[PDB]
Design an enzyme around this catalytic site. Structure first.
Site, PDB file in Angstrom:
ATOM      1  N   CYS A 143       0.865  -1.167   0.000  1.00 20.53           N
ATOM      2  CA  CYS A 143       0.000   0.000   0.000  1.00 20.53           C
ATOM      3  C   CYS A 143       0.913   1.232   0.000  1.00 20.53           C
ATOM      4  O   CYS A 143       2.047   1.159   0.468  1.00 20.53           O
ATOM      5  CB  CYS A 143      -0.889  -0.023   1.264  1.00 20.53           C
ATOM      6  SG  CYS A 143      -2.318   1.123   1.080  1.00 20.53           S
ATOM      7  N   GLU A 177       1.680  -3.625  -5.827  1.00 19.89           N
ATOM      8  CA  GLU A 177       0.636  -4.638  -5.740  1.00 19.89           C
ATOM      9  C   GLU A 177      -0.584  -4.226  -6.561  1.00 19.89           C
ATOM     10  O   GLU A 177      -0.966  -3.054  -6.572  1.00 19.89           O
ATOM     11  CB  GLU A 177       0.217  -4.840  -4.278  1.00 19.89           C
ATOM     12  CG  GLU A 177      -0.788  -5.964  -4.088  1.00 19.89           C
ATOM     13  CD  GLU A 177      -1.169  -6.192  -2.632  1.00 19.89           C
ATOM     14  OE1 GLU A 177      -0.314  -6.002  -1.752  1.00 19.89           O
ATOM     15  OE2 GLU A 177      -2.324  -6.584  -2.369  1.00 19.89           O
TER      16      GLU A 177
HETATM   17  C1  LIG Z   1      -1.615   7.933  -4.815  1.00 15.06           C
HETATM   18  C2  LIG Z   1      -0.970   9.022  -3.887  1.00 15.06           C
HETATM   19  C3  LIG Z   1       0.138   8.410  -2.993  1.00 15.06           C
HETATM   20  C4  LIG Z   1      -0.172  10.115  -4.682  1.00 15.06           C
HETATM   21  O1  LIG Z   1       0.517  10.940  -3.730  1.00 15.06           O
HETATM   22  P1  LIG Z   1       0.785  12.560  -3.904  1.00 15.06           P
HETATM   23  O2  LIG Z   1       1.552  13.069  -2.685  1.00 15.06           O
HETATM   24  O3  LIG Z   1      -0.470  13.367  -4.057  1.00 15.06           O
HETATM   25  O4  LIG Z   1       1.691  12.499  -5.253  1.00 15.06           O
HETATM   26  P2  LIG Z   1       2.385  13.565  -6.092  1.00 15.06           P
HETATM   27  O5  LIG Z   1       2.108  14.886  -5.424  1.00 15.06           O
HETATM   28  O6  LIG Z   1       3.827  13.180  -6.279  1.00 15.06           O
HETATM   29  O7  LIG Z   1       1.579  13.526  -7.494  1.00 15.06           O
HETATM   30  C5  LIG Z   1       2.011  14.446  -8.554  1.00 15.06           C
HETATM   31  C6  LIG Z   1       0.899  15.454  -8.684  1.00 15.06           C
HETATM   32  O8  LIG Z   1       1.156  16.512  -7.657  1.00 15.06           O
HETATM   33  C7  LIG Z   1       1.246  17.815  -8.309  1.00 15.06           C
HETATM   34  N1  LIG Z   1       2.262  18.658  -7.586  1.00 15.06           N
HETATM   35  C8  LIG Z   1       3.397  18.217  -6.907  1.00 15.06           C
HETATM   36  N2  LIG Z   1       4.101  19.227  -6.342  1.00 15.06           N
HETATM   37  C9  LIG Z   1       3.401  20.346  -6.662  1.00 15.06           C
HETATM   38  C10 LIG Z   1       3.627  21.794  -6.362  1.00 15.06           C
HETATM   39  N3  LIG Z   1       4.631  22.215  -5.664  1.00 15.06           N
HETATM   40  N4  LIG Z   1       2.680  22.670  -6.871  1.00 15.06           N
HETATM   41  C11 LIG Z   1       1.594  22.206  -7.626  1.00 15.06           C
HETATM   42  N5  LIG Z   1       1.325  20.915  -7.938  1.00 15.06           N
HETATM   43  C12 LIG Z   1       2.240  20.052  -7.450  1.00 15.06           C
HETATM   44  C13 LIG Z   1       1.699  17.437  -9.706  1.00 15.06           C
HETATM   45  O9  LIG Z   1       1.463  18.544 -10.558  1.00 15.06           O
HETATM   46  C14 LIG Z   1       0.830  16.206 -10.025  1.00 15.06           C
HETATM   47  O10 LIG Z   1      -0.438  16.527 -10.468  1.00 15.06           O
HETATM   48  P3  LIG Z   1      -0.992  15.446 -11.629  1.00 15.06           P
HETATM   49  O11 LIG Z   1      -0.869  13.975 -11.033  1.00 15.06           O
HETATM   50  O12 LIG Z   1      -2.465  15.843 -12.122  1.00 15.06           O
HETATM   51  O13 LIG Z   1      -0.036  15.644 -12.888  1.00 15.06           O
HETATM   52  C15 LIG Z   1      -2.126   9.813  -3.106  1.00 15.06           C
HETATM   53  O14 LIG Z   1      -3.129  10.312  -4.045  1.00 15.06           O
HETATM   54  C16 LIG Z   1      -2.819   9.001  -2.019  1.00 15.06           C
HETATM   55  O15 LIG Z   1      -2.199   8.744  -0.833  1.00 15.06           O
HETATM   56  N6  LIG Z   1      -4.031   8.585  -2.328  1.00 15.06           N
HETATM   57  C17 LIG Z   1      -4.914   7.809  -1.444  1.00 15.06           C
HETATM   58  C18 LIG Z   1      -4.299   6.446  -1.149  1.00 15.06           C
HETATM   59  C19 LIG Z   1      -4.159   5.636  -2.412  1.00 15.06           C
HETATM   60  O16 LIG Z   1      -5.103   5.536  -3.284  1.00 15.06           O
HETATM   61  N7  LIG Z   1      -2.986   5.051  -2.518  1.00 15.06           N
HETATM   62  C20 LIG Z   1      -2.531   4.168  -3.664  1.00 15.06           C
HETATM   63  C21 LIG Z   1      -3.144   2.798  -3.418  1.00 15.06           C
HETATM   64  S1  LIG Z   1      -3.000   1.709  -4.881  1.00 15.06           S
END
Ligand SMILES: CC(C)(COP(=O)(O)OP(=O)(O)OC[C@H]1O[C@@H](n2cnc3c(N)ncnc32)[C@H](O)[C@@H]1OP(=O)(O)O)[C@@H](O)C(=O)NCCC(=O)NCCS
Length: 273
Positions: A143, A177
């Protein structure tokens, strides 16, 4: 007599609304909130209770070995069996933002890699990814989660990049996964894309699948899917490769323009079991 659902958790200065239900072993009352200590992850039905325990003497970071530390973040490796309570609390918190998650109580089979951002205020847990100590499918991530209050800041990509550095150190390819949530799959696709794009510009204009998996620990399947999406798959010198083109250069510069933080492999002080 109101019997409320958990509609909000109070973590530090943040009041976060859950996306999904999580099995917190708590009494249902006329209130719809609980306090989550941002260090211990312990839950409290009353502010007073939270305060009472907040005063106690405790470390101000995840309960594990700090196997990575740069000027931006730290990663703590925690063996679920060694920190059952904390990890169970982490899983309960995580489930609030996951459609499905394995029984939160059984943390023994997992290793948790928790990332913290360090400020003048110290460590702040921003996200984590769990990993099966033993995965029959070779999944290098079970996860993965970036706390809501910290999402879309680039932390997710850092978590993913780190998981591949572990795989690389282990001399094995790996993949998250399945099935992945849409949020998760879209984040991996971006990471995989950014990775191949960076390699093509900083390493070689043409690279074989073997070379790619060796340098990134990405599996053949994830590499091919990503290469086909970018339209960079070809045949050269007797084998399949990905190649650089103006589109890739353009993407690379746009990526760099964002001046995003990355993981420095040299700072990972870790040896696989
Ligand atoms: C999946 C997950 C881990 C992604 O984590 P996150 O911290 O939001 O990831 P990131 O920030 O690296 O994603 C990049 C995105 O952030 C944005 N971003 C990052 N830094 C930024 C900044 N300084 N200013 C503006 N936007 C920014 C990017 O533009 C990008 O947007 P896009 O995906 O539309 O192109 C998160 O959505 C989450 O925990 N979700 C719920 C749990 C889940 O579903 N987990 C996966 C299980 S399979």
């Amino acid at each position: 007599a109101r019997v409320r659902n958990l509609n909000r958790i109070i973590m530090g200065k943040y009041e976060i609304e859950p996306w999904y239900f999580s099995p917190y072993p708590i009494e249902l009352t006329d209130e719809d909130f609980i306090y989550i200590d941002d260090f211990t992850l312990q839950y409290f039905g009353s502010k007073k209770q939270y305060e009472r325990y907040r005063k106690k003497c405790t470390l101000r970071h995840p309960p594990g070995n700090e196997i990575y530390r740069d000027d931006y973040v730290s990663f703590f490796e925690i063996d679920g069996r060694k920190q059952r309570t904390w990890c169970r609390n982490l899983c309960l918190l995580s489930k609030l933002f996951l459609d499905h998650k394995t029984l939160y109580y059984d943390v023994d089979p997992f290793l948790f890699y928790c990332m913290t951002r360090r400020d003048e205020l110290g460590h702040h847990l921003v996200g984590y990814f769990s990993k099966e100590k033993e995965s029959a499918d070779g999944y290098n991530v079970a996860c993965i989660l970036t706390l809501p209050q910290y999402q879309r800041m680039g932390y997710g990509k850092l978590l993913i990049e780190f998981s591949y550095e572990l795989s690389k150190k282990e001399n094995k390819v790996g993949s998250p996964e399945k099935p992945l949530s849409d949020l998760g799959l879209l984040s991996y696709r971006a990471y995989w894309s950014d990775t191949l794009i960076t390699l093509l510009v900083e390493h070689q204009k043409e690279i074989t699948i073997d070379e790619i998996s060796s340098m990134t620990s990405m599996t053949t399947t994830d590499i091919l899917h990503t290469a086909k999406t970018l339209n960079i798959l070809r045949y050269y010198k007797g084998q399949h490769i990905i190649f650089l083109n103006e589109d890739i250069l353009d993407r690379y510069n746009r990526l760099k323009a964002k001046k995003r933080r990355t993981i420095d492999p040299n700072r990972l002080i870790w040896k696989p079991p």
